[PDB]
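Researcher: Quick one. two chains, 149 residues in total.
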Amino acid sequence: SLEWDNLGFSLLPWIRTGLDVMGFETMTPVQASTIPMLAGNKDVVVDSVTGSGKTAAFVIPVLEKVVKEEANTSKFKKAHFHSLIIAPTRELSRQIESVVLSFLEHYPSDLFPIKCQLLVGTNEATVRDDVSNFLRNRPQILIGTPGRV
RNA sequence: UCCAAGGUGAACAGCCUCUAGUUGAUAGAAGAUAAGGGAAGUCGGUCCGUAACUUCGGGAUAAGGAUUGGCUCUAAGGGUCGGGUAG
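Model:
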């Protein structure tokens, strides 16, 4: 069908709003076959061509799992995180973080926020600055390259 | 019943010596080989000449007499400072 409305688990309204504002006009086969299972107690091994909605295909289930496991609540502890994302290069991880930020643009207010932090090797921030703002801001998503993470 | 040196042997062994003990035992004099035959007998016969190898650590980074510079991505690689022309 490739329609967002007739998916198995009825995606969250703000994720749907973000998708509609971004568009895509539909859901790709990768996003149609991965999102229902990656949020449904199944590990996922996905091979797909470049630029086929893969990034959103693994970003939407991440946010769904974050909301599902009550990660965006006062009960969540300090110095803890929920989800990790790893990429082999710094630019790819920064691009993934930009996609996540674009999705979280339409996150509603009046609720405990969901944030992300990028951990890449940079000359503008030591690892101790990363630890300091991780403690202060308390994100639930970490995105970075293997060395700095 | 206790203690127990060294060197050769380079096969327990045997041989020689260091420390330590002996000179004790009546005294003096004056098995091996074989020519020829070969059981005819009797009851009974380790060291000289080659070649490859070969021990311990530390080392990382393709080498180690030469002109050393040596892959892609990926935490850190001592600290600090410093940017023009005009009003």
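The CA atoms of residues 117 and 133 of chain A lie 9 Å apart.
Researcher: Thanks, that's what I needed.
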